[PDB]
């Protein structure tokens, strides 16, 4: 399937363990699909102090079009030093490894893999 029905665990940037997905902005995106592909993967919705507290590069979910059964379309764009690798809509947030973090949210994605 070009999409796959995911429910993302909303994390507070305080609790998170592993603060990004690597060192490259292909590393990220690579583990960024490996993580959602494996039910492994939390969003950090973005506001003012969230990003400095997170690793660059950064993986951001965006919303790629105006949302099946709850569900918004989304796809990633990696971020590194003020440039964006991809094109899309708003941010949904940022994402992260889950390593057990208790969720204040869930946030409902069609994602394109």
Same mark, same amino acid.
């Given at each position: @399937?070009? $999409?796959?029905?995911?429910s993302?665990p909303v994390?507070?940037? /305080?609790?998170? *363990?592993?603060?990004?997905?690597?060192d490259? +902005?292909? =590393? +990220? &995106?690579s583990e960024?699909r #490996?993580?959602? @592909?494996?039910?492994?993967?939390g969003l950090?919705e973005?506001? %003012?102090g969230?990003?400095? #507290? *997170? =690793?660059?590069p950064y993986?951001?979910? %965006?919303r790629?079009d105006a949302?099946?059964h709850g $569900?918004?379309?989304?796809? *990633?764009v990696a =971020? &590194?030093?003020?440039?964006?690798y991809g094109r899309?809509?708003?941010? &949904?947030? +940022?994402?992260v490894?889950?390593?057990? =973090?208790?969720?204040?949210?869930? /946030? %409902?994605? &069609?994602l394109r @893999?």
């Amino acid at each position: @399937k070009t $999409h796959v029905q995911l429910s993302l665990p909303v994390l507070q940037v /305080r609790d998170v *363990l592993v603060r990004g997905f690597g060192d490259s +902005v292909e =590393e +990220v &995106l690579s583990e960024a699909r #490996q993580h959602l @592909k494996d039910g492994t993967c939390g969003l950090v919705e973005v506001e %003012k102090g969230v990003l400095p #507290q *997170l =690793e660059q590069p950064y993986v951001f979910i %965006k919303r790629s079009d105006a949302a099946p059964h709850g $569900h918004v379309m989304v796809e *990633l764009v990696a =971020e &590194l030093e003020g440039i964006q690798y991809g094109r899309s809509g708003e941010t &949904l947030g +940022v994402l992260v490894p889950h390593v057990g =973090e208790i969720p204040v949210a869930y /946030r %409902k994605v &069609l994602l394109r @893999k």
